Design a protein around this ligand. Structure first.
Ligand SMILES: [NH3+]NC(=O)[C@H](NC(=O)c1ccc(Br)cc1)c1nn[nH]n1
Ligand SMILES: [Cl-]
Ligand code: NI
Ligand SMILES: [Zn+2]
Length: 329
């Protein structure tokens, strides 16, 4: 068994190995990468996502989100307060202001300690799920706007044409902006490229242990769990690494820097925070190995979750028994 301890693996593909995206995902899994739930991919030195980032200030963040926290420092929920629209240039200046700028710190570990100590006492502003791409059209390798779509994958595997598209999203972050514990919609894969700016720290639970995190979440957020059998689909719950270790939950952590890809694997729970102003791009994707995960993926039928993008057709084909219930909610 490859990677039996479920460590996060880091890959350094050559420019030749960087041509065939599907092949390299398969290669990483042959080495046991998926057992961690998260892998880092450092692109070859010959590669660039685009020429510069000098001309992105005019992008519009139509609905910036202020992340207000409730709870204790290591166990808390956050809700998203909608703010007036602002451009990326305005957002960058806001992130670097005294109220929101990264504090002095000596290393990633020091900043991590500051994050979990002080996160709940602030409310950073986040730009998320903005349809778009910053990859140059001339970038042919690992361009997140040019992967095979999930709709085509299901057709190839199961023989069924379905409606729907599969396009990338942009994220604008600042210090303490937070993504709560979650798996992807339908427990899909995701791939995230950090285009620009300060790092993002990730936490991840191995897919083979995801149910352990679910059980701890039910214990730590008991009202939330009574309201929905899959409330982590709401993407509002945070649990610190200290509390995870206290409860024996298997997990790993890693910091992603500009110019690095991260891939999350099916049913790999992950959470994290941004260190300062940055810009990332991400999209979900599927492989033949995902189909079995899609069939078994939990759903939220209580109304809250909504979604990154339409799962209707995936639920309809892969989970026909659930379709009606999930539909009504
Ligand atoms: N799969 N998504 C991610 O892992 C994560 N975004 C979220 O979890 C998220 C939560 C609530 C809302 Br609303 C919108 C998005 C991310 N990726 N790069 N930056 N953040
Ligand atoms: Cl701080
Ligand atoms: Ni995610
Ligand atoms: Zn729900």
């Amino acid at each position: 068994a490859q990677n039996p301890n479920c460590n996060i693996m880091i890959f350094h593909p050559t420019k030749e190995e960087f041509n065939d995206f599907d092949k390299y995902i398969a290669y990483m899994e042959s080495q046991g990468a998926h057992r961690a739930g998260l892998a880092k991919i450092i692109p070859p030195k010959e590669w660039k996502a685009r020429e510069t980032y000098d001309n992105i200030s005019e992008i519009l963040i139509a609905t910036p989100l202020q992340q207000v926290a409730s709870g204790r420092a290591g166990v808390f929920t956050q809700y998203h307060k909608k703010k007036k629209a602002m451009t990326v240039g305005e957002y960058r200046h806001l992130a670097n202001s005294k109220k929101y700028q990264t504090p002095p710190h000596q290393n990633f570990e020091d900043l991590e300690r500051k994050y979990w100590k002080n996160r709940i006492y602030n409310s950073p502003i986040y730009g998320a799920d903005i349809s778009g791409s910053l990859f140059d059209e001339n970038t042919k390798q690992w361009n997140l706007g040019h992967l095979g779509t999930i709709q085509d994958l299901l057709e190839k595997e199961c023989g069924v044409v379905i409606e729907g598209v599969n396009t990338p999203y942009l994220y604008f972050g600042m210090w303490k902006t937070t993504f709560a514990w979650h798996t992807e919609d339908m427990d899909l894969y995701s791939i995230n490229y950090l285009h620009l700016g300060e790092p993002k720290t990730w936490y991840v639970v191995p897919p083979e242990h995801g149910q352990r995190l679910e059980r701890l979440a039910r214990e730590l957020f008991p009202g939330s769990s009574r309201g929905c059998g899959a409330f982590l689909r709401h993407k509002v719950a945070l649990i610190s690494p200290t509390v995870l270790k206290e409860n024996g939950i298997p997990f790993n952590r890693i910091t992603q820097e500009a110019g690095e890809f991260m891939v999350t694997f099916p049913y790999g729970y992950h959470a994290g925070f941004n260190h300062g102003f940055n810009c990332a791009e991400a999209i979900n994707f599927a492989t033949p190995r995902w189909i079995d995960y899609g069939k078994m993926a939990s759903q939220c039928s209580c109304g809250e979750a909504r979604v990154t993008f339409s799962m209707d057709a995936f639920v309809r084909i892969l989970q026909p028994e659930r379709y009606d219930l999930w539909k009504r909610g």
